[PDB]
């Protein structure tokens, strides 16, 4: 959550602006003038600079967009309401109305745009449909109005009096209770509202019952209340004559525009009342706010200027393995939707999470800090979303710092350390420390009495490398503990309050981005006579940073709209980009455009992943381009690094030098490359080597096409067979001829059957295993599919003896088909089991018949004692039934 002024639009003739309304769906900005001026603008510098001067003498006061149906509405100081529609790329007046009694104090469209309420000063209220008077125009009472607002369901319609009273209404002139104002208790003078905004949940709510409606008064005190509350987030501001209120598009930030006595200010708050910053706009006086559609830009009216401020929100994102994790709220479901977009395979993995305090990543893992119904949860997840381990902890996971093999969840007064891995699975050693505890070298286990003591210097940020833990506190003091066994090593007492901290791989220095965005560097181990020292690299508008996983000196940062890379305090040329550094490694920066993704969270394009190469790699690549491999090789040898060596080797392989490539592979100590080059040199044909090298880089389709073009279906088939593309093998085997195509196609069909069966996709593997000739797996597919007719057909199609027939007969016995099981066993030539199943399944007729045939004669005693047991149970009828079945008719 950072913010900085970015642009300015000077309205001609220096007329004062009294209202700015940024259309949310379309990037239209409507500006009201002090001398009848009304302008419609659009960015990308303006595109649709328009002067909708039709009518509107005097001044222009209220301006409201209709969003859906895209209808602007505007009013004068003379009561002339005008509704404008976009026709032929220009704004023409569509409707004109004029009530000749007073001045329109406010106007507001419904949550669906079908209904509009307009409130005058004399108390008259006119509610219209999109075309005419919808229901009523009420004259109310002896009251002077200033505001109007609908509810989410458009049922209540709460006004605002001139004297400072909000009145809750019915969607008609039916007066329900007056609102109970809890924010103002000690005020004494007259109070005016000057700002009311109800976040009609249209992008979801940050919390399932978060405060939505927001009321402020010109004195400076605000209340962020849900529906008609009685207890509610109260806020005090030093905003003299607060000028406006504007919720975010997601209702997660509230912007309060005013000016202190002291000078213009646009403060920002969370829905729960947490402060976030201050903008300090120039000019004489602010007049209105308006967020963009995406909440990234805010336009605010100061005198004859529309100042634009760029906003960096607090996205819940992370990068684990090749997966970008990003979370967002949506209107339909009441819980966060977290997409584990795996960039390697362009796959998505949508999870739904209730609390989701934070998302943190490190290595191929991701900690989701959430709030449960053991009150808070830290879900340790894979890179594809599967929760490996939900760990329930009690302290609030306000700040989560995740190192490989450690997770530190810190509230404002304590931190909890949990080892979730070993350099390789859970070896949980959970500990909790109060900030003022000064733990010794090692130790109490899971003692939770330390999280209730309370502190006067709360935690503001935390970070942890593989060796140390740095807790930043609200006074600027940072505390350094030894991570594997938490023990207070040092306190440093920096200058400014920390917002973000990062440690290089050496854990020798710490980058600190304060609350105001200023980036500084601290050197922990650099002892001056003191313990640590600053480094004199203060930057101004930094909002993101990342050290190398390889080089302690290498650093990357984002300032406003440019990325800088530092090699020990020496910046390079900026790169125009607006992205978040996913990874900094091997002279390469992988970043993603979250601003673009979160506008279409369902379909993240691969075009939003951008890779940059730092000066060394770009220089080496360009020098390889300009001069031949021979000289760039010498240059790279002068400045050696494994990434450059691999680049040189791959360039040589592309050129098929096979000598510079081998040397550069030796430099990388890459035995795979050395062996591949030796095998390639043993090969004795060009366009054979070219196919080999285009297979080396993973262009499998290119290699296959290359093999086909040189009239080698054999090697294309071999390449597809080394891989698992068996469908490709079937497609290729359809055309031409081969040395052994029946066996190859049978192998392909069996392999596809296995491919479908390993994924529990029978009735697809059953399609194969039949064109191919597989029996053992086909019986399993029939069994799991419960296609017992297919099992019977398979068993009668097998030869007289087989290793599979007994298994089929066992399957039949389990399911209960006595006849098919008996036939299968007799095919196996196992009459003993064929009669044991008849006994087991109580088919005594068949048992006695098979005993007579195959000469066992041991079933007479079986029947005798079975009937004896039945008689012992007084079930004489059952005994008669068996004796009839077994043809023992005499008994």
């Amino acid at each position: 959550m950072f913010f900085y002024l970015s642009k300015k639009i000077s309205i001609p003739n220096n007329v004062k602006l009294q209202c700015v309304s940024w259309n949310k769906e379309q990037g239209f900005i409507a500006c009201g003038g002090e001398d009848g001026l009304l302008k419609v603008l659009k960015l990308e510098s303006n595109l649709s600079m328009n002067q909708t001067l039709e009518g509107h003498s005097g001044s222009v006061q209220v301006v409201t967009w209709n969003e859906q149906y895209q209808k602007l509405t505007t009013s004068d100081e003379n009561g002339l309401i005008i509704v404008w529609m976009l026709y032929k790329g220009s704004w023409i007046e569509e409707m004109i109305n004029n009530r000749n009694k007073s001045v329109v104090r406010s106007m507001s469209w419904n949550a669906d745009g079908q209904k509009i309420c307009i409130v005058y000063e004399d108390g008259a209220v006119i509610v219209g449909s999109v075309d005419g008077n919808r229901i009523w125009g009420k004259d109310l009472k002896g009251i002077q109005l200033s505001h109007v607002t609908w509810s989410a369901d458009s049922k209540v319609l709460l006004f605002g009096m001139a004297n400072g009273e909000i009145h809750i209404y019915d969607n008609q002139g039916n007066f329900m209770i007056k609102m109970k104002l809890s924010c103002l208790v000690n005020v004494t003078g007259a109070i005016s509202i000057a700002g009311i905004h109800w976040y009609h949940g249209t992008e979801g709510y940050v919390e399932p019952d978060c405060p939505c409606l927001a009321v402020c008064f010109d004195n400076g005190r605000c209340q962020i209340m849900r529906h008609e509350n009685d207890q509610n987030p109260v806020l005090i501001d030093t905003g003299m004559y607060v000028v406006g209120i504007q919720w975010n598009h997601m209702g997660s930030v509230l912007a309060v525009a005013g000016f202190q006595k002291a000078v213009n200010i646009v403060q920002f708050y969370t829905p729960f009342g947490e402060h976030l910053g201050t903008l300090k706009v120039p000019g004489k006086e602010i007049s209105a706010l308006s967020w963009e559609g995406g909440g990234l830009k805010i336009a605010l009216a100061v005198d004859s200027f529309i100042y634009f401020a760029n906003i960096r929100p607090n996205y819940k994102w992370g990068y684990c393995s090749n997966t970008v994790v990003y979370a967002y709220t949506r209107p339909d479901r009441p819980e966060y939707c977290v997409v584990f977009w795996d960039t390697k395979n362009n796959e998505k993995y949508v999870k739904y999470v209730k609390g989701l305090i934070s998302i943190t990543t490190c290595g191929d893992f991701c900690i989701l800090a959430t709030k449960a119904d053991a009150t808070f949860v830290l879900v340790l997840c894979n890179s594809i979303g599967t929760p490996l381990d939900p760990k329930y902890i009690d302290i609030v996971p306000l700040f989560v710092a995740m190192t490989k093999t450690h997770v530190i969840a810190a509230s404002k007064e304590a931190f909890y350390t949990w080892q979730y891995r070993v350099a390789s699975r859970k070896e949980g050693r959970e500990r909790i420390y109060h900030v003022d505890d000064t733990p010794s070298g090692s130790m109490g286990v899971l003692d939770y009495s330390k999280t209730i003591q309370g502190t006067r210097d709360p935690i503001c940020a935390i970070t942890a490398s593989d060796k140390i833990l740095i807790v930043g506190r609200e006074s600027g003091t940072i505390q350094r503990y030894s991570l594997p066994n938490v023990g207070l090593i040092q306190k440093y007492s920096l200058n400014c309050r920390a917002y973000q901290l990062s440690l290089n791989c050496n854990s020798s220095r710490l980058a600190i981005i304060d609350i105001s965005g200023v980036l500084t560097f601290f050197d922990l181990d650099a002892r001056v006579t003191v313990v640590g020292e600053l480094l004199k690299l203060e930057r101004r508008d930094v909002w993101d940073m990342k050290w190398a996983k390889d080089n302690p000196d290498l650093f990357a940062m984002m300032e406003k709209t440019r990325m800088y890379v530092f090699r020990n305090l020496d910046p390079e040329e900026p790169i125009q980009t607006s992205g978040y550094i996913c990874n900094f490694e091997d002279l390469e920066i992988k970043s993603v455009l979250l601003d673009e993704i979160l506008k279409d969270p369902e379909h993240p394009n691969k075009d939003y992943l951008i890779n940059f190469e730092i000066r060394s790699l770009r220089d080496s690549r360009a020098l390889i381009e300009k001069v031949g491999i021979k000289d760039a090789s010498q240059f790279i040898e002068d400045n050696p690094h494994p990434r450059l060596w691999r680049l040189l080797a791959e360039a040589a392989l592309q050129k098929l030098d096979l000598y510079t490539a081998e040397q550069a592979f030796v430099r990388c100590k890459d035995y795979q490359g050395i062996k591949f080059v030796k095998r390639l040199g043993k090969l004795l044909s060009e366009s054979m080597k070219q196919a080999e090298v285009v297979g080396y880089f993973g262009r499998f389709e290119e290699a296959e096409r290359t093999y086909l073009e040189m009239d080698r279906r054999d090697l294309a088939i071999g390449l597809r067979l080394k891989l698992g593309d068996w469908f490709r093998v079937l497609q290729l085997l359809k055309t031409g001829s081969g040395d052994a195509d029946d066996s190859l196609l049978e192998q392909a069909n069996n392999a596809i059957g296995d491919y479908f069966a390993d994924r529990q996709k029978w009735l697809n593997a059953v399609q194969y295993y039949v064109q191919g000739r597989n029996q053992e797996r086909l019986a399993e597919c029939y069994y799991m599919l419960e296609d017992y007719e297919g099992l019977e057909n398979l068993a009668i199609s097998l030869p007289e003896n087989h290793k599979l027939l007994p298994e089929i007969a066992q399957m039949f016995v389990r399911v209960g088909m006595c006849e098919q099981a008996v036939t299968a066993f007799l095919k196996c030539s196992q009459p003993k089991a064929a009669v044991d199943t008849c006994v087991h399944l109580n088919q005594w007729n068949k048992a006695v018949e098979l005993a007579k045939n195959h000469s066992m004669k041991e079933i007479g005693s079986l029947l005798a004692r079975y009937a004896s047991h039945l008689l012992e149970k007084n079930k004489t009828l059952d005994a008669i039934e068996l004796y009839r079945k077994a043809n023992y008719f005499f008994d």
Partner: protein, 707 residues
């Protein structure tokens, strides 16, 4: 349905009316001349309020938890406040029959035998309006805009806040059917209006409707309950009763109705008026049948003076078959939810669904008087168009219900009875002690298998097409939550000690025990996987390995592929099984084929690579090839192909292959040791000269100097 009596306490006079504090902390009665204040949690009488001089007839809070009124036979109304002190008072010309508070504006409305009076909190006098006859009921609308007065003439006068009669609803019969109770449906947006709350001075007296969707429940003394709209039109037909009603009310969200009166009992009804069951059976007329503001608790005060506090408990009625899960919604509907596509389907039964059984293309619903049999007809895996196949009209008594293709199974005591879909009875099996569990285990359409467990501890398998039970096991303690492995080769039992015992069904031998199980589910797709929940913790076993337990709210209903399905308070939920833990457990035991079988259920790519490399080091080239294919590493795939062809041509040394694998990962030292052990130091020398590690090549110059 089941109601448990939390506490019962008897007063010395008939209980006329009751009221709940909106927080639910305490309740207030009207017994004789005093107002008894009880604590809802326990029933301990706090204070008898002693303001009135005659019998108290009515009481009601202000929906704000700050005041409550009470009118009495002394022709007076006293407004008390919280902390139980009388602060305001006024009088009528007759005994006050009932008093109510406006849900929004706190405008008190107190009726009497001749007139009704309205009083706003800020008003300085009571506005009295005459009435046609004796009023007995008051009911403010949810938005607080209209007031319904039921009268002894069998007439409801619906009036505005001023007192003008907006509409008049005339119950058939006139004075034949006095209107003794009314209640507005409390289900609206205004229900949440007051969920975020935070010297007796006598008061003087001063003498569209079409688009609105409001329902007034009316309890007449012609023994009927009607539902009227605000426009006077009736909703549906009447519901004939055989008792005089004296109290009609609603739950918190207006989903169920409470009805008491001349019958010495209290009954729960659907919001449409279909009877669901009995709440309590009393010894006198129930004069009031209110319900706790935000819970299932109900309180019943009768003429005997008895006050009873029941907690209503609703039983989960559901069935699940593989990827389909049917449950009971709103006590009269059946919701069939697909566990893959999540395409829910609702089936309206208009009657209290007692039991549900589901099966492939079959859905049995036991209504109180009949069983409905539903079928699927389209041959689509995601088909969700259930049509009625049969209606077995018979008052059925059964402990359990099961449904099979072309059959229905009823468990009743020791009788396991098998009926056709037309109601014909085909077979019957007599059991040993008592049938505790039953479950279809698949089979041919008309020849399916059933898995039965008994309180005897004996576990049997019964085939629908034959008259004999096959004995599977004779356990020691009772049986509960039987389940069978996907291959029908393993059984899993819970035996009243939460001890999940797993048996090998063919050798009668048990494989392992677990000490905490309330529900067991075998993986329908992976045979080795097992799941069991008990004690608030999930558990996932892979073969005879340790468990990977989570925390859980609910009990396990199913386990399909890689998803657990658990039920928590009628809400289904899916838990994503971590396949990596069983994968690594199989890997550490050097079991590569089984590790691959577990991995195929879904893991990341790093786990796939780890399994591939561990297979390579373990010299299982088939599983290594398959895992590498799922990672598509042409380098390692070509290495494995080269090793396979070298093995094919005759090379049968298992240390050369491991040396090559080590050299190819990058060990360069263990590979050299393996090369030397396998009798090839020349290959180690070649590796070290190729890597230009000539200081190590001096070590493997074993041959000497023959060039």
């Amino acid at each position: 349905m089941r109601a448990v009596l939390t506490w019962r306490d008897k007063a010395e006079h008939c209980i006329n009316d009751i009221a709940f504090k909106p927080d639910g902390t305490q309740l207030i009665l009207a017994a004789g001349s005093r107002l008894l204040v009880y604590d809802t949690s326990d029933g301990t009488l706090l204070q008898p309020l002693k303001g009135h001089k005659d019998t108290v007839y009515c009481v009601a809070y202000a929906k704000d938890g700050k005041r409550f009124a009470s009118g009495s036979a002394d022709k007076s109304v006293i407004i008390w406040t919280s902390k139980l002190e009388g602060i305001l008072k006024y009088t009528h010309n007759d005994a006050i029959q009932c008093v109510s508070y406006n849900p929004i504006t706190h405008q008190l409305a107190s009726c009497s035998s001749s007139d009704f009076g309205l009083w706003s909190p800020e008003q300085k006098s009571v506005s009295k309006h005459k009435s046609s006859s004796k009023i007995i009921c008051c009911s403010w609308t949810n938005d607080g805009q209209y007031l319904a007065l039921g009268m002894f003439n069998g007439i409801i006068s619906i009036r505005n806040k001023n007192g003008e009669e907006k509409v008049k609803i005339e119950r058939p019969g006139g004075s034949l059917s006095p209107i003794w109770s009314i209640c507005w449906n409390p289900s609206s947006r205004w229900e949440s209006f007051w969920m975020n709350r935070e010297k007796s001075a006598v008061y003087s007296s001063q003498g569209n409707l079409e688009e609105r969707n409001d329902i007034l429940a009316v309890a007449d003394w012609g023994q009927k309950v009607s539902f009227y709209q605000l426009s006077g039109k009736q909703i549906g037909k009447d519901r004939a009763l055989n008792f005089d009603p004296c109290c009609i009310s609603y739950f918190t969200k207006g989903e169920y109705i409470l009805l008491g009166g001349s019958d010495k009992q209290v009954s729960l009804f659907t919001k449409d008026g279909v009877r669901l069951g009995t709440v309590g059976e009393q010894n006198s007329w129930v004069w009031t049948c209110q319900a706790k503001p935000d819970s299932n608790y109900v309180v019943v005060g009768c003429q005997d003076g008895t006050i009873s506090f029941y907690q209503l408990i609703f039983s989960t009625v559901h069935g699940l078959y593989k990827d389909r899960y049917a449950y009971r919604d709103s006590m009269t509907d059946v919701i069939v939810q697909h566990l893959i596509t999540e395409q829910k389907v609702r089936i309206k039964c208009k009657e209290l669904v007692k039991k549900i059984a589901i099966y492939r293309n079959r859905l049995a619903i036991q209504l109180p008087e009949k069983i409905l049999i539903y079928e699927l007809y389209s041959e689509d895996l995601s088909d969700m168009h259930y049509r009625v196949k049969e209606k077995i009209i018979k008052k059925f008594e059964c402990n359990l219900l099961v449904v099979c293709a072309n059959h229905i199974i009823l468990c009743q005591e020791k009788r396991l009875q098998c009926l056709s879909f037309s109601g014909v009875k085909e077979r019957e099996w007599q059991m040993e002690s008592l049938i505790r569990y039953i479950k279809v285990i698949g089979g041919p359409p008309g020849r399916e298998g059933l898995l039965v467990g008994l309180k005897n501890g004996q576990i049997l398998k019964i085939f629908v097409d034959n008259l004999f039970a096959i004995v599977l096991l004779k356990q020691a303690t009772a049986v509960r939550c039987l389940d069978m492995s996907a291959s029908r080769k393993k059984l899993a039992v819970v035996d009243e000690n939460d001890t999940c015992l797993v048996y090998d069904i063919d050798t009668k031998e048990l494989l392992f025990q677990e000490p905490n199980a309330n529900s067991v589910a075998w993986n329908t797709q992976c045979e080795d996987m097992l799941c069991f929940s008990g004690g608030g913790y999930l558990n996932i076993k892979a073969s005879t390995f340790p468990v990977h337990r989570q925390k859980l709210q609910g009990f396990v209903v199913g386990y399909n592929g890689s998803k657990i399905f658990c039920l928590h308070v009628f809400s289904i939920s899916a838990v994503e099984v971590p396949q990596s833990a069983p994968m690594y457990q199989y890997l550490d035991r050097k079991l590569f084929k089984e590790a691959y079988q577990i991995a195929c259920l879904g893991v990341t790519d790093t786990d796939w690579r780890e399994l591939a490399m561990e297979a390579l080091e373990g010299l299982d080239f088939e599983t290594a090839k398959k895992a590498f294919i799922r990672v598509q590493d042409l380098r390692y795939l070509e290495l494995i192909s080269s090793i396979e062809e070298r093995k094919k041509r005759g090379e049968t040394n298992n240390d050369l292959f491991l040396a090559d694998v080590f050299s190819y990962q990058g060990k360069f030292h263990e590979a050299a040791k393996l090369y030397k052990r396998s009798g090839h130091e020349n290959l180690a020398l070649e590796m070290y000269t190729d890597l230009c590690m000539f200081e190590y090549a001096k070590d493997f110059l074993g041959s000497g100097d023959p060039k």
